[PDB]
Amino acid sequence: GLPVMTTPGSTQFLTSDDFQSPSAMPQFDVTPEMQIPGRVNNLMEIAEVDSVVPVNNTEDNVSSLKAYQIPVQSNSDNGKQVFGFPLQPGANNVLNRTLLGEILNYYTHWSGSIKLTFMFCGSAMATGKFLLAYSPPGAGVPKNRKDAMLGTHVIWDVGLQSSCVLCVPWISQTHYRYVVEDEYTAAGYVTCWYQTNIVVPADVQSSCDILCFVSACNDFSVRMLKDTPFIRQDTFY
Amino acid sequence: GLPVMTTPGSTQFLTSDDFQSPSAMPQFDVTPEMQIPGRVNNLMEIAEVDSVVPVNNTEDNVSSLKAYQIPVQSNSDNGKQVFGFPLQPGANNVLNRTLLGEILNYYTHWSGSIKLTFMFCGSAMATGKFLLAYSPPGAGVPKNRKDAMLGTHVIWDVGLQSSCVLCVPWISQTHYRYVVEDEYTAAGYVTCWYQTNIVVPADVQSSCDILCFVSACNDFSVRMLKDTPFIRQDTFY
Amino acid sequence: FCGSAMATGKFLLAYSPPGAGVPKNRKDAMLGTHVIWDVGLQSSCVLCVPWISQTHYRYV
Amino acid sequence: LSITTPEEMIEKAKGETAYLPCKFTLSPEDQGPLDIEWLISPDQVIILYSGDKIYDDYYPDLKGRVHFTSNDLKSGDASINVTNLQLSDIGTYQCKVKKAPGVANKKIHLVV
Amino acid sequence: LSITTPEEMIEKAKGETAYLPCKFTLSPEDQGPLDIEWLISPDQVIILYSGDKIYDDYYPDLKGRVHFTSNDLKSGDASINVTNLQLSDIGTYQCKVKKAPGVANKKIHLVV
Amino acid sequence: SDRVRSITLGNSTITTQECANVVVGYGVWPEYLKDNEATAEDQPTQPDVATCRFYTLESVQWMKNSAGWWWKLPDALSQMGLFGQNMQYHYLGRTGYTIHVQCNASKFHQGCLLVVCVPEAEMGCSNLNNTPEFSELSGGDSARMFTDTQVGESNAKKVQTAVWNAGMGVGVGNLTIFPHQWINLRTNNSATLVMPYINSVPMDNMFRHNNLTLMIIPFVPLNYSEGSSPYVPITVTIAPMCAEYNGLRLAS
Amino acid sequence: ARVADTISSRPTNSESIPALTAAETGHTSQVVPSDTMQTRHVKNYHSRSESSIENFLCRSACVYYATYTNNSKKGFAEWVINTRQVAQLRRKLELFTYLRFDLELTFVITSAQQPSTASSVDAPVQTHQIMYVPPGGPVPTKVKDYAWQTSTNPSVFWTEGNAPPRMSIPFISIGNAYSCFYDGWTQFSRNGVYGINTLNNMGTLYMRHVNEAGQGPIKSTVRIYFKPKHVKAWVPRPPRLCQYEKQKNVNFSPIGVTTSRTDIITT
Amino acid sequence: QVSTQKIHYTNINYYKDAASNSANRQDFTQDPGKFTEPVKDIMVKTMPAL
Amino acid sequence: QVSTQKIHYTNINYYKDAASNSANRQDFTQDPGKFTEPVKDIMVKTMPAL
Amino acid sequence: QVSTQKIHYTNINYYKDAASNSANRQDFTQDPGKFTEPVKDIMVKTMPAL
């Protein structure tokens, strides 16, 4: 008869407890394991895979394959914009349903930097240059090329190699950032501008298209697991 | 099946218990700490800061800055009193709302000695002398300078340096003292008397003012934490 | 300061390099090189203007 | 809370002014609001003190004849001055003070 | 949920168009459906916004005279434009927004 | 001796004949951001001569019926040269200040000031449900002043300027727990504080968050006889120490 | 952690004056009572243990209580977690500017019968569910819904007649310390509300019954109790004098410094 | 694991987190020098201040 | 038996099965190279890809 | 920690206070000489008292 006293917090069912439990079928021998290829060990081995970013929604391309293409045509005037969006990878409706965005909508805080792989899926004799700018917040969106070249930017040329990875850095006052749309920890905007035109020879089509990927760096991290807002239910199937 | 017996005192919720508890979010990694300047480690690093003592209430100066000033004028007759109050640093309504008095109104017992920093905030060519007396209890308040100079007192002269710290000692029969108004452990009175007049040259104002601080020594201590009587409530905000 | 003994004050001794005009407010002159002089027992203050020029010499 | 002498006998003459004392001290637990009553049984209240304001029109035979004495009622003074004593003022007077969590009585027997 | 200025006084003239602002921000816990009301007490609803569709035939004296202003109501705009102000439009207007688990009010006093 | 100091910084120099000792923060000196504490992913810029100099704000007249003044500290330096231009093009930035306030009178005036530097000074509005706006809370290099009378209820968005509550609902006698000094015209002439970077995050934006507040409150009011000089001005000088920035963008 | 002792002294007469000083330099004097009188060597055995931070703050206090009726539609209680609503705890927190602590949430749940109409009512023991939602998760609207069960938010299930439930929450913040005060807006155009920060959001708490309406409505009531542990405080602050009025802002009405007395020499 | 109280007592950590431990209640250190004397030039008690 | 937490803690197995133990929560290993670079010829960062 | 009873028994202190321990019940010491003979000159049994 050892004397004990029961602390508060007993006879409860916490849904994230770590306790042992008596087995139902004792002395069960499981079937032995196998070297199945492709063992995932961490969910940060999924954010380091690229996925195409549907950056061309516009209410008519959402139910199609046109949502992944950015139309790039041989313009007549110079210094025009190609696209642009704020960088909220759990709150914006462009980086939402990508492979990175459906991992961040299980967690609450995130950190680290983001890679943005582009690809010129155009013709072979058509060349050009692009300016991939990322402006940190505090001001509005940039509106001219003269205002966007002050931020962080690379200048991309298309040749034999047809990719360019703008790696946006981690410039923030806090050690983490929310995934829901907040104003305190916004992460600026990412734009893309014509440097020169898209020149093209005779008897070639003009409107070349560009794809865009997204991925995480080697130093990405998350925190505070929550439940997703993307799946509803009203009955049992 | 180890045999146990539950002592009385189980299945209760004591509001000052020290027990472990299962976490809700396991394997959480907190954000790392920072060398923020000004780390407080003990609440006896707050009572060793001076604060101005509102010793001039008189029902008209309470809603003003006049409550901190002691009017000191060039008197005509000699041996008059400047101020006076009993030394109950949680019970009197002069040492109540100071920085020392709003720490002692979280505890019940106190001990140690008290410093009383004064400061002559007058002109530069006006001199004078003051007598800062502290009389232990048992008798009434002193009423003449002849009765107050028998206690513990310093004689303050104003010159280049313009401060004088009367350090009242710890003279009490008990090892502690209450903070509420009791008659058993009262701590006497502190008065202040004109030694000589305040002389002054021509074309200078006469009514110089004096500020008064209060602080604790290096050997102050408290006990028996309670809840304060200064903040009421009737609803949720 | 060749004044009285009980009179005090403070002064701002500014030197502005060329390129702009003369300064016109105290807000414009405190951007240059300046010392802030107090008068007390000692009654002097030596603003030492530096040698800020593109050339190794200067005309008279 | 404790009164100095919870019962005594006071002997005065007619036309004089009675002085019924009621003093107390304060134990450290007493932190609530103050309350002071006075009774008579020749159980009718004759004066009150609650919420810092005096209410004193309660007994018709003693209308405008009884007052508190001191100006410092929160220091241990609850004495009243009965002016113009008459023959019909015979009865036990009860000084009920109630500062929570304390309570005390004082039965003053007044015979003229 | 929080409105910029929960009460003020607006002074306009007759025949003009009033502009009663109601802006807000969004704390991160607010994830439910949106709800926007407007009241009057010269406690009658004058406009609604729930389920992404506007219902606006509620007050007979203001029939077809009040409209929302912006096209981006889920960004922190709830201002209304009161056209053709008359003398009988005196009363406190109440902008009630309720996105769960948040709720806020704004009592706009309009005097012409 | 022990009365004279001469603090210099960059291309300026503040000298004082009569002043007390200098008080430095909570016991630390403003140094650069160490690599263990940083969180930004790029390299900072350190001008270090273009910012670290003594800017001078406007002056205020100390009348007899004065109340007090306050400045919001990384907002008064918004137009002062290369500090005000590096604050706009960047996004982050940490600072450490060296506040200096000076007010001279003769041996015949009497009075006493209190110079305190309050971190995170939230002020109270006039109406209990509103919040004060930006134009009535601080000014570019212009001191906002307290009053000696409670602000009426008819105002919509105005700061409560009751001086015995110091605007923040706190007793003004307890304000000495912050780093502070006293200006006393009997024995002192100039007060000086050194304030390190005090914030819960290692770097912060500077247009949205004023993380210091220099308050000046006269306890003993100014008083003299007829025949003395009636105009006594106060003038404050602030110099940022060891500043650095991050995150270029457009102007705003 | 004993306090300092006191050493004896002799009647001196010399040039070294320990009592005269100057408070202009912001330096609170460090004198001992052995410098202005004659003392005896007192062995001193007091302790400064109960004045530390971990003995001043680690005590449980109520933060909120809400009631909810079993026989109702939308009968359930939501509450965003914040310290600002009670006043006996809030004044203890604003002594310091930056705090850092974990938390031990504890609930005390009581029930009461409503004046029902049905005859010979009898109910078995009830069950309560206290769901904790981190900031951003999907929240439920009605009580009979599938978002209550089918979720990975950490909830706790409790039945009556047992010990009160208790869960522990670590330091969930984005900065390095909770900010008790935030002077400056949250939008870069400097418009809108004043002191609203996104540095001390901890989430909401959703509480409801699990049983169904058998014969008689039951109105419950649940109190929530904090307990900060491992606390580190920074940059102290003078204590709040005027009364609180709102939970978000710091606004107030002016009042005098202290209660008055009759005359400056009245003891 | 085993330490003294205010004789000894035995304390074992059970859960494998850090926020699950009991309160320390024995962090006895103080340093009031960063509030009383936050000055640059050092100040002696016996000598005059100026 | 005794290991560190996120100081130490003590864990004892009681039941004599394998499915009765508590969750590990401390299997900290990762290898993203089988998803990022699943190629045959190795690829350097600095050199061009073709 | 382990001592004899009125065979042995094992007692462990759990809480980290001093007022939380159980009662001692084994403080067996007495000295009646300060009540029976509180005198200055010592007194022998066998000799006469005066």
TrEMBL record, chains A, B:
Subcellular location: Host cytoplasmic vesicle membrane; Host nucleus; Virion
Protein family (similarity comment): Belongs to the picornaviruses polyprotein family.
Role, per record: RNA-directed RNA polymerase: Replicates the viral genomic RNA on the surface of intracellular membranes. May form linear arrays of subunits that propagate along a strong head-to-tail interaction called interface-I. Covalently attaches UMP to a tyrosine of VPg, which is used to prime RNA synthesis. The positive stranded RNA genome is first replicated at virus induced membranous vesicles, creating a dsRNA genomic replication form. This dsRNA is then used as template to synthesize positive stranded RNA genomes. ss(+)RNA genomes are either translated, replicated or encapsidated. Protein 2B: Plays an essential role in the virus replication cycle by acting as a viroporin. Creates a pore in the host reticulum endoplasmic and as a consequence releases Ca2+ in the cytoplasm of infected cell. In turn, high levels of cytoplasmic calcium may trigger membrane trafficking and transport of viral ER-associated proteins to viroplasms, sites of viral genome replication.
This protein's name: Genome polyprotein
Source organism of the structure: Coxsackievirus B1
Parent-record interval covered: 333 to 569 of 2182
UniProtKB/TrEMBL annotation, chain F:
Subcellular location: Host cytoplasmic vesicle membrane; Host nucleus; Virion
Origin superkingdom: Viruses
Family named by the database record: Belongs to the picornaviruses polyprotein family.
Assembly description: Homodimer. Interacts with host GBF1. Interacts (via GOLD domain) with host ACBD3 (via GOLD domain); this interaction allows the formation of a viral protein 3A/ACBD3 heterotetramer with a 2:2 stoichiometry, which will stimulate the recruitment of host PI4KB in order to synthesize PI4P at the viral RNA replication sites.
Function, in words: Plays an essential role in the virus replication cycle by acting as a viroporin. Creates a pore in the host endoplasmic reticulum and as a consequence releases Ca2+ in the cytoplasm of infected cell. In turn, high levels of cytoplasmic calcium may trigger membrane trafficking and transport of viral ER-associated proteins to viroplasms, sites of viral genome replication.
Official protein name in the record: Genome polyprotein
Species of origin: Coxsackievirus B1
From TrEMBL, chain G:
Compartment(s) of residence: Host cell; Virion
Organism: Coxsackievirus B1
Domain Picornavirus capsid: 34-200
Gene Ontology biological-process annotations: symbiont entry into host cell; virion attachment to host cell
Pfam families found in the cross-reference section: Rhv
Protein name per its UniProtKB record: Genome polyprotein
A GO cellular-component term linked to this record: viral capsid
Keywords on record: Capsid protein, Host-virus interaction, Viral attachment to host cell, Virion, Virus entry into host cell
InterPro entries cross-referenced by the UniProt entry: Picornavirus_capsid, Rhv-like, Viral_coat
Molecular function terms, GO-annotated: structural molecule activity
From TrEMBL, chains H, I, J:
Keyword Lipoprotein: yes
Native source species: Coxsackievirus B1
Function: Component of immature procapsids, which is cleaved into capsid proteins VP4 and VP2 after maturation. Allows the capsid to remain inactive before the maturation step. Lies on the inner surface of the capsid shell. After binding to the host receptor, the capsid undergoes conformational changes. Capsid protein VP4 is released, Capsid protein VP1 N-terminus is externalized, and together, they shape a pore in the host membrane through which the viral genome is translocated into the host cell cytoplasm.
Gene Ontology MF terms in the entry: structural molecule activity
Protein known as: Genome polyprotein
Entry superkingdom: Viruses
One GO term (biological process): symbiont genome entry into host cell via pore formation in plasma membrane
Cellular compartment(s): Host cell; Virion
Record text on subunit structure and interactions: Interacts with capsid protein VP1 and capsid protein VP3 to form heterotrimeric protomers.
GO CC, alphabetical: host cell; viral capsid
UniProt keyword terms in alphabetical order: Capsid protein, Eukaryotic host gene expression shutoff by virus, Eukaryotic host translation shutoff by virus, Host gene expression shutoff by virus, Host-virus interaction, Lipoprotein, Magnesium, Myristate, Pore-mediated penetration of viral genome into host cell, Viral attachment to host cell, Viral penetration into host cytoplasm, Virion, Virus entry into host cell
Location of this fragment in the whole protein: 4 to 68 of 141
Similarity section: Belongs to the picornaviruses polyprotein family.
